[PDB]
Enzyme design. Structure first.
Site, PDB file in Angstrom:
ATOM      1  N   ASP B  25       0.805  -1.202   0.000  1.00  0.00           N
ATOM      2  CA  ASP B  25       0.000   0.000   0.000  1.00  0.00           C
ATOM      3  C   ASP B  25       0.848   1.267   0.000  1.00  0.00           C
ATOM      4  OD1 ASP B  25      -1.956   1.922   0.244  1.00  0.00           O
ATOM      5  OD2 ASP B  25      -2.964   0.974   1.954  1.00  0.00           O
ATOM      6  N   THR B  26       1.033   1.835  -1.187  1.00  0.00           N
ATOM      7  CA  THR B  26       1.802   3.072  -1.316  1.00  0.00           C
ATOM      8  C   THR B  26       1.145   4.309  -0.701  1.00  0.00           C
ATOM      9  OG1 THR B  26       0.907   3.507  -3.529  1.00  0.00           O
ATOM     10  CG2 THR B  26       2.945   2.273  -3.366  1.00  0.00           C
ATOM     11  N   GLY B  27      -0.167   4.255  -0.454  1.00  0.00           N
ATOM     12  CA  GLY B  27      -0.882   5.341   0.214  1.00  0.00           C
ATOM     13  C   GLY B  27      -0.887   5.246   1.741  1.00  0.00           C
TER      14      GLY B  27
HETATM   15  C1  LIG Z   1      -8.967   5.475  -0.466  1.00  0.00           C
HETATM   16  C2  LIG Z   1     -10.148   4.495  -0.474  1.00  0.00           C
HETATM   17  C3  LIG Z   1     -10.757   4.255  -1.843  1.00  0.00           C
HETATM   18  C4  LIG Z   1      -9.850   3.232   0.324  1.00  0.00           C
HETATM   19  N1  LIG Z   1     -10.663   2.008   0.346  1.00  0.00           N
HETATM   20  C5  LIG Z   1     -10.878   1.109  -0.795  1.00  0.00           C
HETATM   21  O1  LIG Z   1      -9.935   0.852  -1.805  1.00  0.00           O
HETATM   22  C6  LIG Z   1     -12.153   0.279  -0.635  1.00  0.00           C
HETATM   23  C7  LIG Z   1     -13.284   0.781  -1.517  1.00  0.00           C
HETATM   24  N2  LIG Z   1     -12.615   0.356   0.779  1.00  0.00           N
HETATM   25  C8  LIG Z   1     -12.888  -0.863   1.570  1.00  0.00           C
HETATM   26  O2  LIG Z   1     -12.624  -2.191   1.140  1.00  0.00           O
HETATM   27  O3  LIG Z   1     -13.534  -0.638   2.815  1.00  0.00           O
HETATM   28  C9  LIG Z   1     -14.100  -1.752   3.513  1.00  0.00           C
HETATM   29  C10 LIG Z   1     -14.437  -1.267   4.910  1.00  0.00           C
HETATM   30  C11 LIG Z   1     -15.824  -0.652   5.117  1.00  0.00           C
HETATM   31  C12 LIG Z   1     -16.101   0.207   6.361  1.00  0.00           C
HETATM   32  C13 LIG Z   1     -14.941   0.622   7.268  1.00  0.00           C
HETATM   33  C14 LIG Z   1     -13.654  -0.200   7.162  1.00  0.00           C
HETATM   34  C15 LIG Z   1     -13.293  -0.809   5.807  1.00  0.00           C
HETATM   35  C16 LIG Z   1      -8.775   3.169   1.391  1.00  0.00           C
HETATM   36  O4  LIG Z   1      -9.176   3.863   2.504  1.00  0.00           O
HETATM   37  N3  LIG Z   1      -7.441   2.560   1.282  1.00  0.00           N
HETATM   38  C17 LIG Z   1      -6.537   2.541   2.462  1.00  0.00           C
HETATM   39  C18 LIG Z   1      -6.253   1.098   2.879  1.00  0.00           C
HETATM   40  C19 LIG Z   1      -7.545   0.328   3.121  1.00  0.00           C
HETATM   41  C20 LIG Z   1      -8.115  -0.515   1.983  1.00  0.00           C
HETATM   42  C21 LIG Z   1      -9.371  -1.348   2.247  1.00  0.00           C
HETATM   43  C22 LIG Z   1     -10.044  -1.229   3.615  1.00  0.00           C
HETATM   44  C23 LIG Z   1      -9.458  -0.365   4.722  1.00  0.00           C
HETATM   45  C24 LIG Z   1      -8.338   0.612   4.383  1.00  0.00           C
HETATM   46  C25 LIG Z   1      -5.177   3.118   2.088  1.00  0.00           C
HETATM   47  O5  LIG Z   1      -4.671   2.281   1.056  1.00  0.00           O
HETATM   48  C26 LIG Z   1      -5.217   4.542   1.535  1.00  0.00           C
HETATM   49  O6  LIG Z   1      -3.911   4.755   1.009  1.00  0.00           O
HETATM   50  C27 LIG Z   1      -5.472   5.622   2.577  1.00  0.00           C
HETATM   51  C28 LIG Z   1      -5.475   7.012   1.936  1.00  0.00           C
HETATM   52  C29 LIG Z   1      -5.934   8.172   2.827  1.00  0.00           C
HETATM   53  C30 LIG Z   1      -4.949   8.956   3.697  1.00  0.00           C
HETATM   54  C31 LIG Z   1      -5.500   9.678   4.928  1.00  0.00           C
HETATM   55  C32 LIG Z   1      -6.962  10.138   4.931  1.00  0.00           C
HETATM   56  C33 LIG Z   1      -7.888   9.684   3.800  1.00  0.00           C
HETATM   57  C34 LIG Z   1      -7.346   8.723   2.742  1.00  0.00           C
HETATM   58  N4  LIG Z   1      -4.385   5.501   3.572  1.00  0.00           N
HETATM   59  C35 LIG Z   1      -4.648   5.311   4.982  1.00  0.00           C
HETATM   60  O7  LIG Z   1      -5.906   5.046   5.479  1.00  0.00           O
HETATM   61  C36 LIG Z   1      -3.449   5.197   5.881  1.00  0.00           C
HETATM   62  N5  LIG Z   1      -3.421   6.555   6.444  1.00  0.00           N
HETATM   63  C37 LIG Z   1      -2.128   7.231   6.481  1.00  0.00           C
HETATM   64  O8  LIG Z   1      -0.951   6.646   5.988  1.00  0.00           O
HETATM   65  C38 LIG Z   1      -2.100   8.658   7.014  1.00  0.00           C
HETATM   66  C39 LIG Z   1      -1.885   9.685   5.912  1.00  0.00           C
HETATM   67  N6  LIG Z   1      -0.928   8.687   7.913  1.00  0.00           N
HETATM   68  C40 LIG Z   1      -1.092   8.443   9.348  1.00  0.00           C
HETATM   69  O9  LIG Z   1      -2.320   8.015   9.923  1.00  0.00           O
HETATM   70  O10 LIG Z   1       0.078   8.626  10.149  1.00  0.00           O
HETATM   71  C41 LIG Z   1      -0.066   8.679  11.589  1.00  0.00           C
HETATM   72  C42 LIG Z   1      -0.213  10.081  12.196  1.00  0.00           C
HETATM   73  C43 LIG Z   1      -1.589  10.505  12.720  1.00  0.00           C
HETATM   74  C44 LIG Z   1      -1.783  11.832  13.469  1.00  0.00           C
HETATM   75  C45 LIG Z   1      -0.572  12.699  13.819  1.00  0.00           C
HETATM   76  C46 LIG Z   1       0.818  12.094  13.595  1.00  0.00           C
HETATM   77  C47 LIG Z   1       0.996  10.920  12.623  1.00  0.00           C
HETATM   78  C48 LIG Z   1      -3.510   4.112   6.942  1.00  0.00           C
HETATM   79  C49 LIG Z   1      -3.719   2.712   6.352  1.00  0.00           C
HETATM   80  C50 LIG Z   1      -2.264   4.137   7.832  1.00  0.00           C
END
Ligand SMILES: CC(C)[C@H](NC(=O)[C@H](C)NC(=O)OCc1ccccc1)C(=O)N[C@@H](Cc1ccccc1)[C@@H](O)[C@H](O)[C@H](Cc1ccccc1)NC(=O)[C@@H](NC(=O)[C@H](C)NC(=O)OCc1ccccc1)C(C)C
Ligand SMILES: COc1ccc(Br)c(OC)c1C(=O)O
Ligand SMILES: COc1ccc(Br)c(OC)c1C(=O)O
Lengths: 99, 99
Positions: B25-27
């Site tokens: 996961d690059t995001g």
């Molecule tokens: C972007 C969407 C289309 C996406 N989901 C999908 O591809 C599909 C449709 N979703 C899906 O299958 O959802 C099922 C389900 C339903 C209800 C709730 C739970 C899950 C997704 O959220 N993808 C995420 C992974 C994932 C995939 C499937 C299910 C659950 C999660 C990351 O790959 C995607 O790259 C996101 C992008 C993002 C960034 C932040 C806000 C909004 C969007 N990154 C993240 O969620 C990561 N966050 C981060 O890397 C943030 C930017 N850094 C961070 O939290 O650093 C800590 C920090 C916090 C506060 C202060 C200091 C440091 C996380 C996995 C660690």
């Protein structure tokens, strides 16, 4: 280009005649853009991720230019803090993961 | 290997004595695994995604193998539905995005 991952893969895009940055995101099924105006029809949808869900407006056949590569597909617009380029568009620009 | 993105980039990993599938996961800044035990006394951490923030457990100095590439680092554990390999580990295995 080859992009290493020491930093977030944030790249220049062009959409709706506007320069933006977006995250090349292999963990996104879909493309999700920060709230903005796009003309024409859309449909209400929801998408899920780490925090739960958000409501988005779904637009079809949206053109995005990504590092000078064209992609056209479905784009979701809503309350994301980052523009996300998902796999639906990454495949169109021939993006792969390599190690 | 070279991984195309028509489907989710799931690969097999080994961690905590358990074989699992995980998303390259690059995001993702950080690596986040589905509920499990890991060795060590964890620290709390907030992470943010689509839908908002969640509080998770941070384990440092965790060994993980990702398609035969050994890595060591910080791994978060919390209410994710999918095991997520984030950039902290992707850099260690020499993973790049290419197009
Ligand atoms: C972007 C969407 C289309 C996406 N989901 C999908 O591809 C599909 C449709 N979703 C899906 O299958 O959802 C099922 C389900 C339903 C209800 C709730 C739970 C899950 C997704 O959220 N993808 C995420 C992974 C994932 C995939 C499937 C299910 C659950 C999660 C990351 O790959 C995607 O790259 C996101 C992008 C993002 C960034 C932040 C806000 C909004 C969007 N990154 C993240 O969620 C990561 N966050 C981060 O890397 C943030 C930017 N850094 C961070 O939290 O650093 C800590 C920090 C916090 C506060 C202060 C200091 C440091 C996380 C996995 C660690
Ligand atoms: C399921 O509900 C929605 C999904 C996406 C959107 Br956009 C919605 O509109 C704000 C709604 C709604 O009607 O509240
Ligand atoms: C401090 O940087 C972030 C950490 C987690 C998240 Br979620 C962020 O939002 C995308 C940001 C940011 O806005 O840069």
């Amino acid at each position: 280009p080859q992009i290493t991952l020491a930093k977030r893969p944030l790249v220049t895009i062009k959409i709706g005649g506007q320069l933006k940055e977006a995250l090349l995101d292999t963990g996104a099924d879909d493309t999700v853009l920060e709230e903005m105006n796009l003309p024409g029809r859309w449909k209400p949808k929801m998408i899920g991720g780490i925090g739960g869900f958000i409501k988005v407006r779904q637009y079809d056949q949206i053109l995005i230019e990504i590092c000078g590569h064209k992609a056209i597909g479905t784009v979701l617009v809503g309350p994301t803090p980052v523009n996300i380029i998902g796999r639906n568009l990454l495949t169109q620009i021939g993006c792969t993961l390599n190690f």
